[PDB]
Amino acid sequence: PDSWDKDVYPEPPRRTPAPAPQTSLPNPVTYLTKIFDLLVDRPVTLAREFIEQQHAKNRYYYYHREFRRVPDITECEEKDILCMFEAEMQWRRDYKVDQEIVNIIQERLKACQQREGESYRQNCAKELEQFTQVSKAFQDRYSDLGAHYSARKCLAKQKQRMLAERKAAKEAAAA
Amino acid sequence: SDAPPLTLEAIKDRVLYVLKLYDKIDPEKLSVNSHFMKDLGLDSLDQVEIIMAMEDEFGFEIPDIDAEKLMCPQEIVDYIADKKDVYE
Amino acid sequence: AFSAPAAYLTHQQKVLRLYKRALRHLESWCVHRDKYRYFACLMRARFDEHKNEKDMVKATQLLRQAEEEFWYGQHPQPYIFPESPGGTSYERYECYKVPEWCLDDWHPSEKAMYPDYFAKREQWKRLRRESWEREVKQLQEETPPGGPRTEALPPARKEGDLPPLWWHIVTRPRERPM
Amino acid sequence: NVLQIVRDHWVHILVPVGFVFGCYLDRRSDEKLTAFRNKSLLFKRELRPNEEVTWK
Amino acid sequence: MLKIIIPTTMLLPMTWMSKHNMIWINATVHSLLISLISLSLLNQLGENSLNFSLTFFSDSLSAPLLVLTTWLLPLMLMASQSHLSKETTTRKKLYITMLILLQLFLIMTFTATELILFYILFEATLVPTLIIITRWGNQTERLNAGLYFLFYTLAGSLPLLVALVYIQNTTGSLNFLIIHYWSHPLSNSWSNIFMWLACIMAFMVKMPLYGLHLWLPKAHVEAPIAGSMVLAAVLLKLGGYGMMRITTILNPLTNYMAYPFLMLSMWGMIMTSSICLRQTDLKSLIAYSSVSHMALVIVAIMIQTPWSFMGATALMIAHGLTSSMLFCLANTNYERVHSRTMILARGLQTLLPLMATWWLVASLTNLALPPSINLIGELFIITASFSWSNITIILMGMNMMITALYSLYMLITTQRGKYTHHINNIKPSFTRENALMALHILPLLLLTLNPKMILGPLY
Amino acid sequence: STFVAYLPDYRMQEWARREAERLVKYREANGLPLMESNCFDPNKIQLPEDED
Amino acid sequence: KRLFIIKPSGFYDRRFLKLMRFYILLTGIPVAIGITLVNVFIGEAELADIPEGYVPEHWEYFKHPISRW
Numbered sequence A: 001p002d003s004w005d006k007d008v009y010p011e012p013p014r015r016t017p018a019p020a021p022q023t024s025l026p027n028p029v030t031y032l033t034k035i036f037d038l039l040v041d042r043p044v045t046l047a048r049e050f051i052e053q054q055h056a057k058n059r060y061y062y063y064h065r066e067f068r069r070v071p072d073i074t075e076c077e078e079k080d081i082l083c084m085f086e087a088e089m090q091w092r093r094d095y096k097v098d099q100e101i102v103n104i105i106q107e108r109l110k111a112c113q114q115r116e117g118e119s120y121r122q123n124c125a126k127e128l129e130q131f132t133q134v135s136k137a138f139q140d141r142y143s144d145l146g147a148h149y150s151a152r153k154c155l156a157k158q159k160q161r162m163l164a165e166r167k168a169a170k171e172a173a174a175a
Numbered sequence B: 001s002d003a004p005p006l007t008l009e010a011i012k013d014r015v016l017y018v019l020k021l022y023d024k025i026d027p028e029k030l031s032v033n034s035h036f037m038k039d040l041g042l043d044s045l046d047q048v049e050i051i052m053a054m055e056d057e058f059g060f061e062i063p064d065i066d067a068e069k070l071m072c073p074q075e076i077v078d079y080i081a082d083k084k085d086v087y088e
Numbered sequence C: 001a002f003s004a005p006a007a008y009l010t011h012q013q014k015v016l017r018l019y020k021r022a023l024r025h026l027e028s029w030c031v032h033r034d035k036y037r038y039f040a041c042l043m044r045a046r047f048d049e050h051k052n053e054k055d056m057v058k059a060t061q062l063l064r065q066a067e068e069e070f071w072y073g074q075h076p077q078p079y080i081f082p083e084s085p086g087g088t089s090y091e092r093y094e095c096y097k098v099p100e101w102c103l104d105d106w107h108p109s110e111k112a113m114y115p116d117y118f119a120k121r122e123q124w125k126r127l128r129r130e131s132w133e134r135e136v137k138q139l140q141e142e143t144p145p146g147g148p149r150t151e152a153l154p155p156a157r158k159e160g161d162l163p164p165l166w167w168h169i170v171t172r173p174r175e176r177p178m
Numbered sequence D: 001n002v003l004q005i006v007r008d009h010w011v012h013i014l015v016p017v018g019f020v021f022g023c024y025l026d027r028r029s030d031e032k033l034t035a036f037r038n039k040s041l042l043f044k045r046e047l048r049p050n051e052e053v054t055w056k
Numbered sequence E: 001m002l003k004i005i006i007p008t009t010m011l012l013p014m015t016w017m018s019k020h021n022m023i024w025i026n027a028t029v030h031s032l033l034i035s036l037i038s039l040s041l042l043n044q045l046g047e048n049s050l051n052f053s054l055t056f057f058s059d060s061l062s063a064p065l066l067v068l069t070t071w072l073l074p075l076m077l078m079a080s081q082s083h084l085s086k087e088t089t090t091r092k093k094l095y096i097t098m099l100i101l102l103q104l105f106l107i108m109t110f111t112a113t114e115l116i117l118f119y120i121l122f123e124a125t126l127v128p129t130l131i132i133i134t135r136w137g138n139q140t141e142r143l144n145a146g147l148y149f150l151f152y153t154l155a156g157s158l159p160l161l162v163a164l165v166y167i168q169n170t171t172g173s174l175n176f177l178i179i180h181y182w183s184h185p186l187s188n189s190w191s192n193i194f195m196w197l198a199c200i201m202a203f204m205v206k207m208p209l210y211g212l213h214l215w216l217p218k219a220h221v222e223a224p225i226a227g228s229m230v231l232a233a234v235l236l237k238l239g240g241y242g243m244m245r246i247t248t249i250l251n252p253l254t255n256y257m258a259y260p261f262l263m264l265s266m267w268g269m270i271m272t273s274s275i276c277l278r279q280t281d282l283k284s285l286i287a288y289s290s291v292s293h294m295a296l297v298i299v300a301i302m303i304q305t306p307w308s309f310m311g312a313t314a315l316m317i318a319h320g321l322t323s324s325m326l327f328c329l330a331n332t333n334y335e336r337v338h339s340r341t342m343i344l345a346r347g348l349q350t351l352l353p354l355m356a357t358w359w360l361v362a363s364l365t366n367l368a369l370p371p372s373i374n375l376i377g378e379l380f381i382i383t384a385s386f387s388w389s390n391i392t393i394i395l396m397g398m399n400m401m402i403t404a405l406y407s408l409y410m411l412i413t414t415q416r417g418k419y420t421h422h423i424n425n426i427k428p429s430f431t432r433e434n435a436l437m438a439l440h441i442l443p444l445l446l447l448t449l450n451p452k453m454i455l456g457p458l459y
Numbered sequence F: 001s002t003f004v005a006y007l008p009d010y011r012m013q014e015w016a017r018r019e020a021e022r023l024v025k026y027r028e029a030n031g032l033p034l035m036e037s038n039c040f041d042p043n044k045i046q047l048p049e050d051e052d
Numbered sequence G: 001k002r003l004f005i006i007k008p009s010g011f012y013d014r015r016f017l018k019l020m021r022f023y024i025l026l027t028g029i030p031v032a033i034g035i036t037l038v039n040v041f042i043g044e045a046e047l048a049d050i051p052e053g054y055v056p057e058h059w060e061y062f063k064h065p066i067s068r069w
């Protein structure tokens, strides 16, 4: 359905085999499906279409909110409380967005596992690989901040990691 | 449904039936008010067996302190009626 | 459970209780009625073998050895009557036994149904009220100055008297209250 | 007859008006913290051709 | 925020100008309306708090606490008007004034921006509580209880004051926003160790932490019903809220200073939960279950993780509601038989069928039956503790097993079995008591459908 | 309860989901990594002089 | 024969339960009807792009009519 973007929530093209009966016995599932369509689905679609005609008579919109980009904690001076406040709010919003990115990737992984059946270990390699990278980046970014996290502590963690990387790169160059 | 509303006459009938099935006591001589010792010449050990037979007949256990006293079929009937709340 | 206990059990009571208990456990071991009759007659003979022993030391020693025999030879899973203390229906109906004083708290709309029952209850309550002082007086006069030696209670000895402390025995809920 | 109601039920308006007054005292407080109204780097905005303040 | 404070202050002149037979009606109605107004604070942001003014602010941690505080006053008034019947008019109004002052102090305590103002209100909550306990308690021990309540708290909080005015002399402010933004690490020194202890022990005594929890089984037991309700539901959570607020300045010192308190909490959980198994006083059993439950909140706050903080908030709210309901349920029986011995009145399910259902639901929430928020908070704390150390699952698991044991035991002793024969004054439940139970239990169950409203600022 | 149930999304959960969808779409088409290891850019960071 | 069944007074529990049911429904039924009428005849908003040079009001960022109100 046009509700969601198919590029961010993909699925295979849904190959469905045609019915190829071999026996002459009646199929009870077909009779029950016809009964369900005639007794259940049709009144549901009628009620839904009535609801949609009532909705179309009144149309209004709600807008996704756009937020400007503000300077981050790195550009703030030591005791400039207002820039620190704006940088921290922007950092918190980015943290929430990253959580939801990981959520989207996890939903892809779960849907792949359910869809592929007994061949999930092989047919979900791409989803597992995407989740591994996203999980590694999220863990590098926010792991171990603890309660009372902030943009300053995240910056200190990143600086410590870059110092470790620089020392490790200097160690390798001496060989 | 469940068991019928057992009455006093039924309790007496079953007690006398069980007593008349006892080889030690003859049927003609036995009476509702007959003492098990004076009237029937029965020992204390013999009396215990009658009490156990009544328990087996009516399906409930009579405590030893209560059991020793019962010396007449009428006494047994009254005890059973008191336990089962039988008023006719 | 209706008779007052005594300070102790006599030798005759102990041997009789042992006889009944051993017979019940023997019946638990001997499921079938003919086999039970056979071994119960053998048990009765074994009890009668010393029916008229006059040496109380010897009688006590024999009873003690009989107890030691029974404890080793008892059935670990004896048959119990369903409503007996160890049975499967021992206190099953206690949740349905409701004391009669609860009827005093019924809303008048509840008492509007059953008018005859509550008129009879009012008569019973008046009877209980009118005979309490006589019962208390009877108890005080009959009992010894030190106090009552046993839990046995006296009957009504006058004409228009009720036996003292009768209300809760008489107004027992039921054995199948619901 | 109005006094027979009012004189023994006026205590029923103390908490309602105490609520209303409370709201008023909040609004005045908001009037003392307007130093950055339409001045933040995240919500700075050109005023509509008729509006005077972005919020009260 | 004055739109809640000022209506609460108007409850005093309204109570004092009411008719002799209308004080309970007016107080109940208007405290319920104040709860309705307080519900608007649940609309919280995802990034920062609701900064009303320089003095008062509301966060996702203090909003559910405020809602519970305002909701508890009508229930206390309903629970108090039965045993205060023979009281004179002026003393009834004085009791209601004590309750209103307590609510006012708690409401300002949960929303103060500055830590010294928070301290002053958090200490002011002592006076009405002590007056309630020592003036309207029923027994002679209530005096001693009061002293235990007064001096355990103050001996903890007097150093805290000395710490706070010390901090402002070095950082320049005690405003919580400034404290959080300008935070700096605590060095590893003896002076910092004692500053850490002064900032923490005051809150530890309020929880209370196993070892300094003696005042609680006295104060809760000897207090009147509204006193014990407010002591369990709100006053214990002051320590949790204050610890959550003050932990920011404490790092990184908390990593090693938390070990003795974590050991005390994880062992005293077992200790108090097992104490509940052999308790002849029903109200004392309910009181000890509170120490067992707050040990978990202490552990969650000490380990300092987002899952632990969420769990601690949820558990504080759920425990407030459940413990208040249990105290009321015990009081219903006490007002019948006038004894707190648990085995005195038995088989009550036969005589009071619907109050038995109330008992069952309260016991089920006490042992954290899923999906109740009791279970949500408990399980979040257990997961965070497992992350902190896997061996914790043994202690945590053991506590769960014990909690179910003394809960259902409490249920089986008082409701099942056969009713004692001599007691004959057990009247049918009043509508007031049944409604008091329902107004405890329905919000608890309703909070299951929207748990994010009680999960704090870390959600 | 009705009032609390229909409270507006001031916590910005749907907003965060929409923003996350936008960036996932943009990054995948680009071929860029879905998530970045460093939240703050390296260019704006001034590490101390040398590793020793 | 039919016997009397001794029971505790069930009048007060039943009265409390019907009182609670009535006082919950008294407001709940109107609320449910209002919510379904709003849902059927005033549906949720539809996500759109912000037109150029237009600043939406703060309530125009939510899709449910009750939440917007």
Ligand SMILES: CCCCCCCCCCCCCCCCCC(=O)OC[C@H](COP(=O)([O-])OCC(O)COP(=O)([O-])OC[C@@H](COC(=O)CCCCCCCCCCCCCCCCC)OC(=O)CCCCCCCCCCCCCCCCC)OC(=O)CCCCCCCCCCCCCCCCC
Pocket: A043, A044, A046, A047, A051, E442, E446, F001, F002, F005, F006, G020, G021, G024, G025, G027, G028, G029, G031, G032, G035, G036, G039, G040, G043, G044
């Ligand atoms: C009893 C006393 C004891 C008290 C107990 C304790 C309680 C204490 C008091 C607590 C107070 C409650 C406060 C809570 C307020 C929250 C209300 C709320 O948020 O509403 C949310 C929700 C509405 O969501 P929404 O966001 O407002 O709407 C979004 C859409 O825009 C809208 O969608 P749409 O525009 O496309 O159309 C939907 C619209 C239109 O619906 C339709 O018309 C479509 C129907 C299709 C039918 C198809 C066939 C029918 C016609 C066919 C034939 C006609 C044509 C052909 C003619 C020829 C005939 C052949 O319908 C509605 O809007 C739903 C009405 C909402 C009613 C909410 C009920 C709670 C009210 C609050 C007060 C409650 C107090 C109690 C009084 C209750 C009085 C009832 O309300 C719901 O109830 C939804 C439930 C649907 C789930 C279906 C079942 C799923 C099963 C899964 C579980 C299975 C596991 C087993 C467990 C089973 C257990 C049940």
Ligand SMILES: CCCCCCCCCCCCCCCCC[C@@H](O)O[C@H](CO[C@H](O)CCCCCCCCCCCCCCC)COP(=O)(O)OCC[N+](C)(C)C
Pocket: E188, E189, E190, E193, E210, E211, E212, E257, E260, E261
């Ligand atoms: C019943 C409920 C009561 C409440 C419980 C409160 C618990 C308070 C406990 C405080 C936690 C730790 C306090 C200080 C940290 C370490 C203490 C010491 O044992 O460790 C060594 C401390 O060294 C020596 O042991 C000095 C301490 C010995 C003298 C103190 C006596 C402690 C005995 C226990 C008293 C009981 C406490 C409660 C009183 C009522 C560490 O080795 P060291 O590298 O050298 O010192 C590093 C610390 N620096 C960085 C500040 C310098």
Ligand SMILES: CCCCCCCCCCCCCCCCC[C@@H](O)O[C@H](CO[C@H](O)CCCCCCCCCCCCCCC)COP(=O)(O)OCC[N+](C)(C)C
Pocket: E035, E039, E064, E065, E067, E068, E071, E317, E443, E446, E447, E449, E450, E454, F001, F002, F004, F005, F006, G064
């Ligand atoms: C007596 C007989 C008993 C049995 C018979 C009863 C018949 C059945 C009635 C029971 C109904 C079963 C419930 C089934 C679930 C449906 C309800 C659900 O849909 O509502 C939830 C909504 O619940 C509310 O969110 C929770 C209510 C909050 C409770 C607050 C209590 C009121 C204050 C009292 C003070 C207490 C202090 C509390 C301290 C914090 C869903 O939340 P949400 O996913 O969003 O909704 C999506 C759509 N929205 C967002 C547009 C609205």
Ligand SMILES: CCCCCCCC/C=C\CCCCCCCC(=O)O[C@H](COC(=O)CCCCCCC/C=C/CCCCCCCC)COP(=O)(O)OCCN
Pocket: E152, E153, E155, E156, E159, E162, E163, E166, E191, E192, E194, E195, E197, E198, E201, E202, E205, E212
């Ligand atoms: C219900 C029982 C609860 C008991 C709570 C009591 C324990 C409270 C913790 C100690 C309280 C006093 C701490 C003082 C406040 C800290 C402020 C501070 O930082 O000052 C320190 C100084 O710290 C101290 O002097 C504190 C030393 C102790 C003085 C009083 C002794 C109290 C008993 C100590 C052990 C008990 C504490 C744990 C007991 C737990 C409860 C049983 C450093 O400042 P400067 O001098 O400027 O140093 C830097 C430049 N030179």
Ligand SMILES: CCCCCCCCCCCC(=O)SCCNC(=O)CCNC(=O)[C@H](O)C(C)(C)COP(=O)(O)O
Pocket: B043, B044, B045, B046, C011, C012, C015, C016, C022, C023, C025, C026, C029, C046, C047, C050, C051, C052, C053, C058, C059, C060, C061, C062, C063, C065, C066, C067, C069, C070, C073, C074, C075
């Ligand atoms: C499965 C079962 C396990 C096996 C159980 C083992 C039990 C032991 C078997 C043998 C029993 C004995 O030793 S027998 C006990 C030994 N001692 C005596 O018997 C003393 C003399 N008894 C009397 O004088 C009384 O009169 C009296 C006889 C009671 C009659 O009284 P009445 O007539 O006035 O009622």
